[PDB]
Amino acid sequence: AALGPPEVIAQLENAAKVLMAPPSMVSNEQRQHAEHIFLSFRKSKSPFAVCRHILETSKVDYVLFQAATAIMEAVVREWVLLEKGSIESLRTFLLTYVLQRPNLQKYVREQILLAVAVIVKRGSLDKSIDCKSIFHEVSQLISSGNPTVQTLACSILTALLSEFSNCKRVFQEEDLRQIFMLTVGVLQEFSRRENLSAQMSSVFQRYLALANQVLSWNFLPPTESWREALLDSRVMELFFTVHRKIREDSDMAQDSLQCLAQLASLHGPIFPDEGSQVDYLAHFIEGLLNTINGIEIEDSEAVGISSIISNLITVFPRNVLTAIPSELFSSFVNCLTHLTCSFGRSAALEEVLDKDDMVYMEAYDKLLESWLTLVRKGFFTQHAVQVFNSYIQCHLAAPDGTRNLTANGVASREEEEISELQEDDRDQFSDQLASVGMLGRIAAEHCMPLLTSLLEERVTRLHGQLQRHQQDNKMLDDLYEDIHWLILVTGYLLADDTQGETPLIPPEIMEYSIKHSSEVDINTTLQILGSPGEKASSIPGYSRTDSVIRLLSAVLRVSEVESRAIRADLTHLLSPQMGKDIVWFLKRWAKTYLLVDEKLYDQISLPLSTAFGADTEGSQWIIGYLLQKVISNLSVWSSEQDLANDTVQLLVTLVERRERANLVIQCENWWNLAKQFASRSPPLNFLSSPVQRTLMKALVLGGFAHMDTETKQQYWTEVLQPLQQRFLRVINQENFQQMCQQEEVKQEITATLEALCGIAEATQIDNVAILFNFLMDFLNNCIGLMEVYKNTPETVNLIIEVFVEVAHKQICYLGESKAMHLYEACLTLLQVYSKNNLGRQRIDVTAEEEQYQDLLLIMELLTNLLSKVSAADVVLYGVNLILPLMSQDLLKFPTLCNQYYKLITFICEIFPEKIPQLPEDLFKSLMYSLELGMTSMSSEVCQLCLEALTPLAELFLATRHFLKLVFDMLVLQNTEMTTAAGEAFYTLVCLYQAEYSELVETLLSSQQDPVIYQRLADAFNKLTASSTPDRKQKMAFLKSLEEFMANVGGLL
Amino acid sequence: SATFPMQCSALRKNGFVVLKGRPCKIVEMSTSKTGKHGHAKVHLVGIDIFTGKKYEDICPSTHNMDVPNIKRNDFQLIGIQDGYLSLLQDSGEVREDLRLPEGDLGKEIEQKYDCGEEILITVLSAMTEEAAVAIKAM
Amino acid sequence: PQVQFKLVLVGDGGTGKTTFVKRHLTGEFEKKYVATLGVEVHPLVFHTNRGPIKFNVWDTAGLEKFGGLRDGYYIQAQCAIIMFDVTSRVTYKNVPNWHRDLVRVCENIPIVLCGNKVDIKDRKVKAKSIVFHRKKNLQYYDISAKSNYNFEKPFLWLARKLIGDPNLEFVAM
Ligand SMILES: Nc1nc2c(ncn2[C@@H]2O[C@H](COP(=O)(O)OP(=O)(O)OP(=O)(O)O)[C@@H](O)[C@H]2O)c(=O)[nH]1
Ligand SMILES: [Mg+2]
């Protein structure tokens, strides 16, 4: 841009007035013209003097902003051309410019300080401008008493901090420490002086926040300098006092408390030994308790305090926690309990008040998390009782609890519409429920009778309320919420999640049952467990029953209430949420308190051995009871997808481990569930597709349990035989084409295919060769079905889905011959699909959607085919068949695009020799796909292609064409620098050195001023010097490409 | 025939349903509940399989919705009679009742018909309406 | 004197910004991905118990190549929405960068963080892992552009903060 003419400044200011005008009044041609004016101005060569003139003359803040941006981009673009004196003169010009204009617009000031920080960091990359000069200027700026100049220095430090986030680490060890010490000193001087002015309080705010950002820097290095900076007690006491002074600001309080939490999170090797951790932790707990006990927590401090406490408990190891004075530890845990219950009640109030900013729920969550980390003879028992009772009180309805109490009793407001995406309470509050469960374990002697009493009372109340609802509408939902939270707490109290291993009976529960096993008559206990229909209070001596089994019997009694409501037409009055709770609970019970293996415990109590043992009739009763539960839910709960899927999952839990499947298959309800499902009766056909798939998986899974040959043939001929008979009879109904469209046939074929997906999903190591031989015939018939349902998209997609299921689940266990048969079937299916969809053109009604789904499933099929005669030739036939279906618009579906490029790039990297052996159109389509992936689309796709070029360098015309593209990727301007880009660049450079020297010389000839030609010449010469026509040959070529990019990346 | 009832919860996200009287392909199907313990209600929205207009409805689960019986057939084009497609089934029958579709597809039919190519036409019969929707050429 | 605010929509490319706005506007969800070039300003009207409010949401470009003026669009912005993909962790790692740029050009304007695509099964960024809501002017929401999930939440919160009435609620016209 010209320096002087009025047209330059006029263009910039007019463009600014256009871009800042209300967007609905400016045409897009004018907008794009203005932003082209600014963008082209910022790309000009050496606009430094021009931008100086603009900053000194223009009065339009937008133009000043864009000028600072121009300096910022040009100083990095032309860094190698500028002298150190001119660069430093520019930096000082920006600093003094913003310094002499205190009323300058904020974003202009911050943009200029960003230019300064960029100049400084860029000077750190080339070791040109050290940080100590800007640090000395900042120190002199702070030494003056002017609050505006102090604010300016704090702004410069914040800019340096943000810009530096080898260079980053060298900044971390040295310069960040000096910044932290400046900020700490400022905070000391501000904490000493009393009564700050209106501006001094703002400088205090900005420097406190600066300390907050300094401490929150990612990975502070563990050096003795940072040791002397952080481990000094005057810093801890400094931030404690500072928080105590500005406590009522509600804004500086958060910065100070976040500083203190960050100081509490120290854990790395910065601690030289284990004793310094004890001293640091002890002093920190001292200052924290002294601060808390003489302070009202208020609202803005809750999350900060809780975060400090949970930081101390979670970060420092337990041996260091127990090495502090015992009185200090006791005061710390007492404070933890007090704040836990207070924050609990406050959060329970925040729920019913429906406030927009939830503060006490976060803090209470942090405190319960720290409880779980801390607890995991009996020391915390009193505290565990207090926190447990506070949780039960905060989650129980109006009469016995404060869940819906607002000191008034308004019971919240209207019911909030809950989406299906909303997580269930047992997931969202999983950490809190686990913590409260553990606290309930160490204090089981009090907690378990409490849960049993509450569950029995709520059970009777629900029975009476449901009987009354046949002859207080909110009272029923409050009761449902009570039973809800009680079931959750009990579940997390009696067992664990683990999710990877076999869950055992928690040791506290087994110990409580062993210690009291002499005070309990196991006969009355089995009467309480065996009779979940009648009240526990009316039984011969219910008081002498095992408390654990009485609690499990309480939730079981809830399950009986629900089931009896199902027996009547009261299913509409029940809560599907409570159904999910009971099903989840029984699922957890089945994994822990069913068929207990005595080899997994040192000692098992007699009540828990006789009722839940291996060969006991108690387990045979519980397993059939859960079966009846699954039959009830699957009979009425079709409309509630969550409850249905959780129910069928409970079924799978009853059939997975053989120890349970051997006992579940002897039940009549299992076989009549098999017949009822295979009959497609009215009640079970209302279930969704995944529920029926899972049900099929459970039945097939049950078919491999202990059976004699008679009931084996009966079982297989009662489960899999109706599928073969109905399917084969339908495809033999004297119909080859005409009758398939009718719903009586299409719905049956759909049901058969879904069932096949279930069978494939039931595959295990001992299922293959049996399930596979059963599915192969169905596949060979699915070929003809593919030929018959050409124009039926959903059925084609479903068939492909069964092929994807079988190929995914079974090919890892198959041999070679079976995998060859599966390969032939898949290749034939893709042949039919390609034959029917080759030159087909459709109108609308989401045809692109349907072909997108089909192609996605096909891509997954080819991938699972590449999981395991050359194993990969059939995949080449597949991509050859479906490649013409890959339109440019179908690649705009990012999932399909990613899958396709992952597949073809995997084929190009591994087994690259088969690529030249492909036909002409296949090779051209692949090469064009690679070029399109490199030149456009996603960065992941571009990196995948660049990764596919290196194992493809070892026909040659496309590889020579790639050299120009990779040269434009790096030497010219996607703009992502990558190691794979450097490796592909190296291999393509050493391959065809003639086109390489042609392109390098062509670029070196088209230059303007020889000053750029000289450094470009030295750069390319240093590139050819390291190349000198793999490992050692490219390892240095990568570092020389890094130096090249760091010396030529600006020259753009 | 014409339509068969199906519980709303069982509707496939990939399937079809009758909305406000028109047969539609379901394009979005989301479930919600009024209370925490409230029963599920489904929000359906689908595209008219013929006109292409967007029809949506919100009805509770467990309630029965009408699902249209969809048929799609392939005839080979053997004539164009004043604007009525003369279509040949693989059974030998010829149907001259279906008109020519408007838009670029009818233009493709006339162009590829005057050029003499063997053109396969896929006609979509839903409830009471029938229309040619696809073209396949070799 | 119509009540209107400037909202800047920022985030990594492909997080579902244009999807969020367009579904908020027409009601159709586009599965195809067409990258935004520069910015596209869309007016959005919400009828509240205190009258209508207009958010001129500036749908900005995620990819740096299509950035246009990028932070230049943030000037005189009154509120912001930062979006990331909960299924793509890198889009979450970049959230503090967007926050930095907004806080540089603007200052203490209220910003809402939105984790999009919560309808996808494999979720990499957990909800409890967020510390961005710990501020008087910052807030986080779980949204799904497909299922129209928590769509009105950022606009209702931002309206409550910009007007200053926590009792403000959205009503039907
Ligand atoms: N599953 C799912 N996909 C979504 C959601 N929102 C958007 N998408 C998809 O994500 C992809 C990207 O969506 P876009 O809105 O175009 O992305 P963007 O915010 O405009 O990104 P840029 O224009 O590059 O800045 C598209 O394929 C959308 O269909 C969602 O909530 N769930
Ligand atoms: Mg966009």
Author numbering:
A (entry chain B): 4 to 168, 185 to 240, 261 to 415, 422 to 516, 528 to 924, 949 to 1034, 1046 to 1064, 1067 to 1122, ...
B (entry chain F): 15 to 152
C (entry chain C): 7 to 179
Paper quotes:
In this paper, we report the first crucial step and present the x-ray structure of the RanGTP·Xpo4·eIF5A complex. Xpo4 has the shape of a toroid and is structurally closely related to CRM1, suggesting that Xpo4 might have evolved from CRM1. Xpo4, as all members of the importin β family, is an α-helical protein built of consecutive HEAT repeats. Eukaryotic and archaeal eIF5A comprises two domains, namely an N-terminal SH3-like domain and a C-terminal oligonucleotide-binding-fold domain. eIF5A contains a unique amino acid, namely an N-ɛ-(4-amino-2-hydroxybutyl)-modified lysine 50 (in human numbering) that is called hypusine.
The final model was refined against a native data set to 3.2 Å resolution, an Rwork of 21.5% and an Rfree of 26.8%. The asymmetric unit comprises two ternary complexes of very similar structure (r.m.s.d. of ∼1 Å). The superhelical arrangement of Xpo4 is interrupted by three anticlockwise kinks (between HEATs 3 and 4, HEATs 9 and 10, and HEATs 13 and 14) that bend the superhelical structure into a toroid-like shape, whereby HEAT 20 touches the loop between HEATs 2 and 3. Xpo4 wraps with four distinct Ran-interaction sites around Ran and thereby buries a large surface area of ∼1,920 Å2. Xpo4 contacts switches I and II of Ran, hence directly sensing its nucleotide-bound state. In the case of the Xpo4 export complex, we found just a very small Ran-eIF5A interface, comprising no more than a single salt bridge between R29Ran and E42eIF5A. Instead, eIF5A sits on an unprecedented binding site provided by HEATs 8–16, and in particular by the intra-repeat loops of HEATs 9, 11, 12 and 14–16. The interaction buries positively charged regions of eIF5A and the hypusine-containing loop in particular; it thereby also precludes off-target interactions of eIF5A within the nucleus. The hypusine side chain bends in an L-shape and hooks into a crooked pocket that is formed by the acidic loop of Xpo4 and HEAT 10.
